[PDB]
Symmetry: D2
Subunit: 97 residues, 4 copies
């Protein structure tokens, strides 16, 4: 349901991690910045599992946005708001090439 | 939950209707831009009820931020995101 | 200046008109939602001219961020702010 | 020209400094997060001077926003975008009471 361009834009900037890591706040993260639930036992995932978690995270935020902005029907503005929150809400790491 | 200044900023611009009205995009709205649900059968409310609907609506935006920005610990940025979304997501009155 | 993915995201949604048209709020627009100035006398442009106007319009948003977020060194956040502002600030085509 | 409520909202959260300081990037800042120009010689300012710099910063961003969002006429959305940029664009400091 998200545009392929919105998904490519987030993947232009969000790195992929196939192994889980602790972020600055000590929470476990994996894939494209996916925060794991408290009981999750996995350490590694596949690229397809990471893609599914990214779609899960984007669609969850879309459903909850709908409920904050009930009259907002412009899908462009929904996607840009979601990409904005994704960029503010996820810690990324510096890369010197 | 929200600062009095954040709430006042939203009321400076949103504007109150104690009677329901059909806004520019065809939805029934009341209070401070609150979109009516089919279980909300009142077409006239008190200012206290208008404020309570506003806090529900801001809480809906807070739920979004708690789930999609779970590590945001900057209350100013939280509040500015909520005000921005309220301004884009609700239509103006008059 | 802007990533190809950021540009593609804006083109996925904005939509191209090689002919000028009066948008929903009454302004003359052309290309990818580019608002005409009185010195822009063409009413028909090439796709290359449409892309050049888009890069001017994104540069106007970049000038805003360079002056009002001068310490922002997160290109992703820069680009998401630019796309959000483009989506709120330009009307859709069809 | 900005609403008193927009100005009070930014002052609810942005602290006032009457003396200049170096931010994380080594730039000089004073007042309500006002970045000083390269040649400025002042070290201290008054609260009225800080207020004028805040209005200067808000109105500069308004003029440049106008030029990025030429069709945006809703003053509420202009003010919220400006407050958002102000909160993202300025470093603030932790206060334990």
């Amino acid at each position: 349901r998200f545009s392929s361009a919105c998904i490519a834009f987030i993947k232009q900037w969000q790195g992929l991690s196939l192994e889980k890591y602790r972020d600055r706040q000590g929470n476990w993260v994996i894939g494209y910045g996916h925060m794991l639930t408290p009981d999750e036992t996995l350490t590694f995932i596949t690229p397809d599992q990471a893609e599914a978690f990214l779609l899960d995270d984007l669609n969850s935020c879309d459903i909850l946005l709908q409920n904050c902005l009930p009259e907002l029907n412009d899908r462009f503005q929904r996607e840009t708001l979601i990409a904005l929150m994704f960029s503010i809400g996820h810690q990324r790491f510096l890369s010197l090439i």
